């Protein structure tokens, strides 16, 4: 539905930011960094 397009895009926008924070956390060390992951 119209929502299907938007909710999926809006989550893609957010999911992307969430994933990018996870990548920046992996770059920081991942479990090695010491900081919990963005979760
Ligand atoms: C971005 O585009 C918008 C996305 C947004 N969706 C969410 O925020 C979904 C979050 C939701 N989690 C929570 O809201 C946190 C609370 C979860 C509570 C779970 C309760 C489970 C048991 C309930 C039993 C009820 C029994 C009957 C009572 C009469 C999630 O993870 O989905 C949006 O706006 O859609």
From Swiss-Prot:
Expressed by the venom gland. It is found in: Secreted. Keywords: Amidation, Cleavage on pair of basic residues, G-protein coupled receptor impairing toxin, Hypotensive agent, Pharmaceutical, Secreted, Signal, Toxin. The keyword Signal applies. Its main location: secreted. The modification Serine amide is found at residue 39. One of its GO terms (cellular component) is extracellular region. GO terms for molecular function: hormone activity; toxin activity. One of its GO terms (biological process) is regulation of blood pressure. Coiled coil: none annotated. Belongs to the glucagon family. Venom protein that mimics the incretin hormone glucagon-like peptide 1 (GLP-1). It stimulates insulin synthesis and secretion, protects against beta-cell apoptosis in response to different insults, and promotes beta-cell proliferation. It also promotes satiety, reduces food intake, reduces fat deposition, reduces body weight and inhibits gastric emptying. Interacts with GLP-1 receptor (GLP1R). Induces hypotension that is mediated by relaxation of cardiac smooth muscle. This is Exendin-4. It comes from Heloderma suspectum (Gila monster). The lineage of its organism: Eukaryota, Metazoa, Chordata, Craniata, Vertebrata.
